Structure formats: C-alpha cells, structure tokens
Amino acid sequence: SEMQHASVIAQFVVEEFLPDVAPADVDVDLDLVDNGVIDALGLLKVIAWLEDRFGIAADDVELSPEHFRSIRSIDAFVVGATTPPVEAKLQ
C-alpha cells in the first residue's frame, strides 16, 4: 500500500496534459519533471486539485521544485502532510 493510489496520482498528471494516454503506460520510476508535464500553470493546477482533495491550503507550506523530483515524491508529500512520511527518499 506504499503506493497509496499511485495510479490515481498518474491519472491527474496524465489527464492534466495527456488524457489520451493510459496512466499504466507511465513509469513512476522516471522523474516527473524530466517529462516536462509540470509547467508554471501546470504546477498551479497540481496544487489546486491535489490540495482540494485533502482540503489543505498550499499557502501553509511553500513548495520547492525539488518536491516535483518525481511522482513518488508527490505521494510522500501528500501522505507526509496528513500522516508521517513512509520510506521517505531522504531516509
């Protein structure tokens, strides 16, 4: 369950720019930024829906470009916000 709905996260980024692509065909082992799917407005859209699902405000914490290091980090960031991080990359 470490993925915590990994396919769901890909579904948002996939639908954010490539909705005609099956999220299962995306490797979560590749950094999300390397794809370039996350842009300036793309970054805003990411926090807008991701924050809306948990009802949390991004203003409470500042996000850095490193937080977009990979989709895996996004799952940890979302979980880290409500519950302690699991196998965080830092540890």
Residue type at 9 in one-letter notation: I
The 10 Å CB-count burial string (b at 16+, else e) for 30-59 is eebeeeebbeeeeeeebeeebbeeeeeeee
Total structural domains in the chain?
1
The domain in which residue 77 lies consists of: 1-91
Which technique was used to obtain these atomic coordinates? Answer: NMR
